């Protein structure tokens, strides 16, 4: 195997395929990238057994077919450490892969290309295309609400649901939920799959082409995304993902609307004197007025008063301020709307000027 490619054509591919690598896995081969040269193309693959990232790099300079695997981090660092415009020649020599650029020479230890773990073959059942910006919005709007290491595995990811001409994402950790729906102009069959948490992040990270098209293929147990010259594939998470419609407040009798920035900064300051681990803050709503209070074990207190548009009975309701701030930070808008019922029930929050995304946060008993 042999090839010579410009540094600038190898940097992004190497960075992207190294994505699924933990950087310190308990398996040497998983710390390597599979390099394959065939028919004028250099293919680079990185994997963590659950998902894989493949990059294809056209080879315009002479090359020879073959394959091997080399340490991902070292190879990337070497390529990025070379000068701008550098030509990188690579030549496989058994248990070592040589790299040369100018008078910079390197020898990396290899592992058989046959030893590289590849996901099993599968069949696509549904596929659609959309702007990378759209997929990116869908993920960024809800990813922060995914669970991390919940025993309820299906929560450690994001639901991707197609319905009508819309693609929707839902994420929740049992305490809060985020849902976003966007139309894509293609009649789609009703379907839903759960993408693993790590897979969601890797997908979000490969989106940078703005209006450049993204191709999605969903199988019974896998999802695949074609982004330019990158192909991301991940296994799916089994389980029944909850129905967001069931947590949305019913017949909200209390409604609040206020500037997003002022609301966010008030919660931010109040948070300073909230319990460091429980982060509880109290909200008191009355005619056109919101009062936010916080106190910690040292008996310190914070109080913020804001002019707001509020209709409904006066009420006190508690919240984990971090959950509230997460929502306000995810909303990049002028005004926010909140719909409530009672002190221990769901509260829905959204951009007062858009219904494309909605957030539900469960209060705390304070």
């Amino acid at each position: 195997m042999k090839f010579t490619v410009e540094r600038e054509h190898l940097l992004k591919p190497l960075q992207q395929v190294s994505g699924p690598l933990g950087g310190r896995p308990t398996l040497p081969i998983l710390g390597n990238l599979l390099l394959q040269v065939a028919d004028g193309t250099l293919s680079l693959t990185g994997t963590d057994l659950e998902m894989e990232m493949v990059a294809r790099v056209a080879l315009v300079q002479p090359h020879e077919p073959g394959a091997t695997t080399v340490p991902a981090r070292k190879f990337f660092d070497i390529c990025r450490g070379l000068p701008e415009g550098a030509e990188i020649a690579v030549q496989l020599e058994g248990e070592r892969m040589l790299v040369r650029s100018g008078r910079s020479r390197f020898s990396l230890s290899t592992l058989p290309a046959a030893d590289f773990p590849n996901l099993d073959d599968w069949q696509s059942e549904v596929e659609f295309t959309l702007p990378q910006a759209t997929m990116k919005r869908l993920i960024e709007a809800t990813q922060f609400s995914m669970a991390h290491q919940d025993v309820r595995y299906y929560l450690n990811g994001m639901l991707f649901e197609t319905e009508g001409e819309e693609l929707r994402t839902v994420a929740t950790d049992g305490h809060r939920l985020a849902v976003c729906s966007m139309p894509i102009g293609q009649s789609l069959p009703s379907h839903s799959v759960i993408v693993p948490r790590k897979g969601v992040i890797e997908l979000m990270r490969m989106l940078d082409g703005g209006d450049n098209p993204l191709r999605v293929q969903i199988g019974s147990n896998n999802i695949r995304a074609h982004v330019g010259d990158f192909i991301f594939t991940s296994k799916l998470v089994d389980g029944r993902f909850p129905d967001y419609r069931r947590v949305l407040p019913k017949n909200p009798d209390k409604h609040l609307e206020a500037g997003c920035d002022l609301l966010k900064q008030a919660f931010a300051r109040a948070a300073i004197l909230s319990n460091e681990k429980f982060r509880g803050v109290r909200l008191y709503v009355s005619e056109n007025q919101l009062k936010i209070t916080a106190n910690n074990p040292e008996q310190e207190e914070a109080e913020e008063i804001l002019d707001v548009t509020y209709s409904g009975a006066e009420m006190e309701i508690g919240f984990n301020v971090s959950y509230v701030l997460d929502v306000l930070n995810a909303l990049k808008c002028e005004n926010v709307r909140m719909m409530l019922t009672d002190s221990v029930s769901s509260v829905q929050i959204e951009d007062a000027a858009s219904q494309s995304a909605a957030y539900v946060v469960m209060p705390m008993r304070l």
């Binding site: 305490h175 947590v247 209060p363 008993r365």
Partner: peptide, 9 residues
């Protein structure tokens, strides 16, 4: 519980 859990019914 101090933090109320979402009720998916």
């Amino acid at each position: 519980s101090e933090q109320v859990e979402l009720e998916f019914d």
